[PDB]
Amino acid sequence: GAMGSMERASLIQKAKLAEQAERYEDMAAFMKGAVEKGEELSCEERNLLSVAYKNVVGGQRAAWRVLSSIEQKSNEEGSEEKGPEVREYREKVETELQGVCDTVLGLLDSHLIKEAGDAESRVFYLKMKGDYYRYLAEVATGDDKKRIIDSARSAYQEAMDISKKEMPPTNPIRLGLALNFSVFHYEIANSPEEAISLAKTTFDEAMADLHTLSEDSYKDSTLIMQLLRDNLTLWT
């Protein structure tokens, strides 16, 4: 660990600076170093961890999709052989993306999830585990696609069960989990009906719980409810 010699508090401070500078690779490395100090993460610290890797892998996924599209076009009828370069470079990006997902999943397994006892931390980390197996599933094609998909489903499902028992329907973590599990059903598991049912029931049950909330609360929950509505509008 190249961050082993830096104070935990300094790593957190620098992660916040990297966020302000949109240096997300740095941000992720600082937060990895903070996790590796062995102490549990606070609510604010968990958000820094997830934002950093979301942006790193997000850029890798966007690049992979561009290259995969070029590759597919190059393998159609009437296309001129370009050689191995497109496949090679797509494989390079894919392998780097898989490495980042493996790193995140290793942090969750060593040892964030096992030490997370409160619902808000346990559901948060299990959602992340589902998210990063989902990203692996987006690029998987070999004899492991089915196992990767089931690993994502299993993590999302355990997070769902906890969130329904321990969190109100408007809790932003519960809402973001349901949004992403719904995307998993639609895009990964070939289950659009399940995706639509989950997004609708999640939206409706949150709607009916809004009356319990303060005003300047739940800006993140309003945002996420709109994303559920956006997906239902695209899917129906």
Ligand X SMILES: C=CC(C)(C)OC[C@H]1O[C@H](O[C@@H]2C3=C([C@H](C)COC(C)=O)C[C@H](O)[C@]3(C)/C=C3/[C@@H](COC)CC[C@H]3[C@@H](C)[C@H]2O)[C@H](O)[C@@H](OC(C)=O)[C@@H]1O
Per CB under 5 A, residues contacting Cl ion are 88-89, 92
Q: Which is nearer to ligand X, 94 or 108 (CB)?
A: 108
CB of 172 to Cl ion, least distance (A): 31
Say whether residue 176 binds ligand X (CB under 6 A): yes
Rounded Cα distance, 181 and 189, in Å: 10
The DSSP 8-state label assigned to residue 167 in this structure reads S
Question: Exposed/middle/buried for 73, CB within 10 Å: 0-12, 13-18, 19+?
Answer: exposed
What contacts 147, CB < 8 A, 6 or more positions away?
none
219 binds ligand X (CB under 6 A): yes
User: Which range touches a second copy (CB under 8 A), out of 64-72, 119-127, 153-161, 172-180?
Assistant: 64-72
* Phi-psi map region of 81: left, alpha, beta (phi>0 left; psi -120 to 50 alpha): beta
Total binding residues for a second copy by CB under 8 A?
23
172-183 and 192-207 helices, crossing angle to 10°: 160
- Sorted by sequence, the CB contacts under 8 Å of residue 42 that are 6+ apart come out as none
Q: Among 71, 150, 158, 220, which residue interacts with ligand X (rule: CB under 6 A)?
A: 220
Assess 14 for contact with a second copy (CB under 8 A). Answer: yes
CB of 125 to Mg ion, least distance (A): 11
Residue 67's binding partner among Mg ion, ligand X, a second copy, none (Cβ under 5 to 8 angstroms by kind) is a second copy
Using the rule CB under 6 A, give the single segment among 30-38, 43-51, 98-106, 139-147 that binds ligand X.
43-51
Residue with tokens 């808000």: 120
Counting contacts by CB under 8 A, is residue 88 touching a second copy?
Answer: yes
Cα separation, 228 vs 65, whole angstroms:
23
Question: Residue 56 and residue 101: Cα distance in Å, rounded?
Answer: 10
212 lines the binding site for a second copy (CB under 8 A): no
Residues that bind ligand X (CB under 6 A): 19, 47-48, 50-51, 54, 124, 127-128, 172-173, 176, 219-220, 223-224
Chain residues binding a second copy by CB under 8 A are 10, 13-14, 17-18, 20-23, 26, 62-63, 66-67, 70, 82-83, 85-86, 88-89, 92-93
